[PDB]
Enzyme design. Structure first.
Site, PDB file in Angstrom:
ATOM      1  N   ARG C 154       0.826  -1.202   0.000  1.00  0.00           N
ATOM      2  CA  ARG C 154       0.000   0.000   0.000  1.00  0.00           C
ATOM      3  C   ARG C 154       0.858   1.249   0.000  1.00  0.00           C
ATOM      4  O   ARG C 154       0.494   2.255  -0.608  1.00  0.00           O
ATOM      5  CB  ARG C 154      -0.919   0.024   1.213  1.00  0.00           C
ATOM      6  CG  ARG C 154      -2.046  -0.946   1.178  1.00  0.00           C
ATOM      7  CD  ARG C 154      -3.068  -0.567   2.205  1.00  0.00           C
ATOM      8  NE  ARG C 154      -2.592  -0.810   3.553  1.00  0.00           N
ATOM      9  CZ  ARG C 154      -2.854  -1.919   4.228  1.00  0.00           C
ATOM     10  NH1 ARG C 154      -3.616  -2.849   3.681  1.00  0.00           N
ATOM     11  NH2 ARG C 154      -2.378  -2.086   5.452  1.00  0.00           N
ATOM     12  N   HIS C 178       1.497  -3.442  13.454  1.00  0.00           N
ATOM     13  CA  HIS C 178       0.610  -3.308  12.312  1.00  0.00           C
ATOM     14  C   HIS C 178      -0.454  -2.238  12.538  1.00  0.00           C
ATOM     15  O   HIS C 178      -1.362  -2.086  11.717  1.00  0.00           O
ATOM     16  CB  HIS C 178      -0.013  -4.665  12.005  1.00  0.00           C
ATOM     17  CG  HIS C 178      -0.562  -4.774  10.622  1.00  0.00           C
ATOM     18  ND1 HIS C 178       0.212  -4.546   9.506  1.00  0.00           N
ATOM     19  CD2 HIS C 178      -1.788  -5.124  10.168  1.00  0.00           C
ATOM     20  CE1 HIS C 178      -0.521  -4.723   8.423  1.00  0.00           C
ATOM     21  NE2 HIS C 178      -1.736  -5.077   8.797  1.00  0.00           N
ATOM     22  N   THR C 233     -10.834  -6.126   3.930  1.00  0.00           N
ATOM     23  CA  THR C 233      -9.924  -6.122   2.794  1.00  0.00           C
ATOM     24  C   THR C 233      -9.412  -7.530   2.543  1.00  0.00           C
ATOM     25  O   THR C 233      -8.970  -8.212   3.467  1.00  0.00           O
ATOM     26  CB  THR C 233      -8.756  -5.154   3.006  1.00  0.00           C
ATOM     27  OG1 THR C 233      -7.975  -5.094   1.810  1.00  0.00           O
ATOM     28  CG2 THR C 233      -7.868  -5.575   4.152  1.00  0.00           C
TER      29      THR C 233
END
EC number: 1.1.1.27
Lengths: 317, 317, 317, 317
Positions: C154, C178, C233
């Site tokens: 990303r 994360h 996602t």
């Protein structure tokens, strides 16, 4: 005082490794097709030349940025061959001359890599497949030659070009010896499951409107017409081998027509490798498709089997 | 009385077409790499030879079963070149001799296919890129040579082999002329975003522990050491070209270091094609990355730019 | 009386086999990406559901014509998992709840397939990577979680979209936990080897013209903004996992940032899995790249390491 | 004060662009399969939802590092659809309800992208293919539905699983309507060019040893048995569509069985789209293969053609 020490903090064995025997016109066709498909996790090259072999390795390694292959190794000793999942034998220099080389190489192939499938690309493919089954001590299913795989490929491109479709669509086969003596089975030729033999009976004969028998005459003729013009054919037979290494490495169970022992079928007692559709997998040849042939077609197998064994009886191993 | 009539009931133009100019060692490396990636929907081949050209075409077409390419055409006339999305010029036989060929071919390239991007693979790449920009009348961004793309590729394989990692991970560049005069920019060399120059200052110098300057000396040396052993390098430069055709056809906007006009940057008023990282797309070169260089590094560009133009002033077009 | 008997004349084991644990939104993203890359020679699926699992298997198998994968098997028992080269653990239902599942599954993973690399895709990835290293009894290098691999992905798409180039060209990394606590190392961010930090010092800060720190704020924000809109996602994290399975199966030695034990580096005595660039191969994690970080950046690792272990101390295994 | 200005020195249009209409279970299956094959140089997504559409786009874009696709755009307006080489219509919510949507979308598809081939994935596929041919004003050859392509795919996996071979090897077709009324032509079913019908006459009947008619009963049954278990089938039909977009984009001239106008053949005067093997290329459907059918098989086409037109007569456009 070192990058590697300071940069990379440590937290092997070949996996899919493929060895290609020979760097010649056709042996580097197979490598760059095998690497172009990203099949091999290691590619070992071996040939009797010291330098070109090192030059073929370095020319490939410089493209490693562009390849899915990590380790490309080439040596004149067969230590590199070790742990090969498939050994593609392109080495060739008339059979009993080639049997000089395969005595010289094939048992070195098998000393370092006992599990390997041996794919024999070199002409004559049918006999040098027997030569390499005799002296390698591998099972029947782990030693196979390319055979009429490429003949089947040339045959489908021709059969498609006349129909304008894509060669993957037109399904037709080539069995038997690799000379004029190949068997184009027209009972299987078709497109989209529409048999061509069914609609036009004149196929597989002396004469027809388009004389579709010329296709099989062009299949066997084109092989040479490529040999005539540029001196020898490589990227056709290298794409075929790469597609075989794909069936075996990727363990697909795809049907290719390859050289395998015909003893026991089509009325042949002799131990002879003749091209028959076979299901290839990781283990080797898994099986053979049983091809329903005209009496006349089984005859071409039978006779052409003898043409091999007649000159395969005097092989000195 | 016809299969095609009875079988196929009708319900063209090239799409991604690529032309490769020349069938030589390196021109058939580019084709079989371009076909091995399935980039081109049509592959046109052109060379001054009548037969080998027809033999290279037929040897590829016989593998069409194994390829994602439908139409592979080869002629000595440039009618086949028509509608080419990219024209890869491998033709070469000392610049003013090559400018004999590019007068002979490049305007035939552009007559049949005006939109084509012209990728110049042939050595000398930097000048024959100018030669082909002068006499093709294409924009600056549609005529580019391979350049140090492959040098960058060889440089990353070396930079990785010393680190044991995969060449895609180690990012370092080669700019400038294609001789000993290439610029390996060490300010960009790194792995996983860890600059190597940063940690060891001894890089880019006369001497170091590993004397990492030997890498750039090996990058320029390996090119010849492949030329020495097997006579010339093909599958490295053919994988590089196939990766360029991929950036342009697939319209990726990837950064390759290719030969483009350096007029206006790095203190160069002359019209000179020197290898600089550039963003390639379908339209052509989209842009150039602006490389921050040592005064000493801009010097090698500046000087080596003159070495080109000093012998690029007497070009007779 | 049988086709198989009459047609197929006989002349197994998983090879590259991959198991995906879970059929959920993200677990079928990984499968169809792994199959879409033709990595696995067998794909095993396992999940706690009886039917959807059988429906995910059949929906994939019906596409086997379109896949390079031969055997796609799915069962609720882990017998299918046997011989897995990689086990992708997507199973997840807050850590000590997930540790209920990984007690329930991870030792069943390892009973049937001892050599497997365990890739942990499930959130929280850093702790469930420790959870699965504790109770699997695999080496440090054979148990790794996805981690900031996708964050790095990303981050490169964003870093490229602002530059218009292709994400493969713009190299920048994400290390650490994360959450908001990931470390975007700007010392490595660059394009074509042109450091962005070098030219604009305002990067990695509170404020800048484009406030490029917003990129890392968008990297962590987009993950949720995809979670907001469609609920979660999948195809981003499934393409990332497929690219990890590729590095490990194809044995590439590529550098991915994955969750591995940070004990011993960056001033951490605790046993904690935190995302660090690591060289992945067939054997496991081969190594770690040593990332040169600002004092402030090592701090975010150090602190965020404690945030994990502070709640990783009460894990009941 | 800018990176983009300082870094990237400037030296567009969609090329292979594909639009997928709908983000649903099956519409994101087609996208991630199309992107997983790197077919589209741009992927446009359109659906009636504002957010999920933006979430499906962002979830794909975050994987752009892992994709060969550069620009992935999604909007609820059809401006994004512009310049589409193929428009995959998955939109569906009983025909005259779907004809509410296709009045609402299909003419917006064609306003922005007149050259597009329209592939109709949505059930009912045969009628919604007519619906989209009526109101789009595209030629017969540029509007085709998926049809029995996937049925043919499921049929080959089944026909192979019984033979243990790989589905690409076993060639058999499915023609006609998409219900129980599909025509499995057994005259074409075969493996390695060995007709199965030829050897066992009991095929295509009420009863047989293996009752191979159960295969076609399983082909039509499995479609639902996947619908039962997980609620609907996606990655089978998304791999099929991606393989169609490949035939058309890569311009392969491959034979797929797709929904096209049957007026004029098999005794049908009505304008009806029924699944027939057709040669697909860049231009559209290039042709149809003429399938030699039993009187009884032409009957199922004829009758099932009427079943469509009987309820296709009351369509209000």
């Amino acid at each position: 005082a070192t990058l590697k020490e300071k940069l990379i903090t440590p937290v092997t064995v070949p996996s899919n490794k493929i060895t290609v025997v020979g760097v010649g016109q056709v042996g580097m066709a197979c490598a760059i097709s095998i690497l172009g498909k990203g099949l091999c996790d290691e590619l070992a090259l071996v040939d009797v030349l010291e330098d070109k072999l090192k030059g073929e390795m370095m020319d490939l390694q410089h493209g490693s940025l562009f390849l899915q292959t990590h380790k490309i190794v080439a040596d004149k000793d067969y230590a590199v061959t070790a742990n090969s999942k498939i050994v593609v034998v392109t080495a060739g220099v008339l059979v009993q001359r080639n049997v000089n080389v395969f005595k010289f190489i094939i048992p070195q192939i098998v000393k370092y890599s006992p599990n390997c499938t041996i794919l024999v690309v070199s002409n004559p493919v049918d006999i040098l497949t027997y030569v390499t089954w005799k002296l390698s001590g591998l099972p029947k299913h782990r030693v196979i030659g390319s055979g009429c795989n490429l003949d089947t490929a040339r045959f489908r491109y021709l059969m498609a070009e006349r129909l304008g479709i894509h060669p993957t669509s037109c399904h037709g086969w080539i069995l038997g010896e690799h000379g004029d003596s190949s068997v184009a089975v027209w009972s299987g030729v078709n497109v989209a499951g529409v048999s061509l033999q069914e609609l036009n009976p004149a196929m597989g004969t002396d004469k027809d409107s388009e004389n579709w028998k010329e296709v099989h005459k062009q299949v066997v003729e084109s092989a040479y017409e490529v040999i005539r013009l540029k001196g020898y054919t490589n990227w056709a037979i290298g794409l075929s081998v790469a597609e075989l290494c794909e069936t075996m490495l990727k363990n697909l169970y795809r049907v290719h027509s390859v050289s395998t022992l015909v003893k026991g079928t089509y009325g042949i007692e002799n131990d002879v490798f003749l091209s028959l559709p076979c299901v290839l997998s990781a283990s080797g040849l898994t099986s053979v498709i049983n091809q329903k042939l005209k009496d006349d077609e089984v005859a071409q197998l039978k006779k052409s089997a003898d043409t091999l064994w007649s000159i395969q009886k005097d092989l000195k191993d």
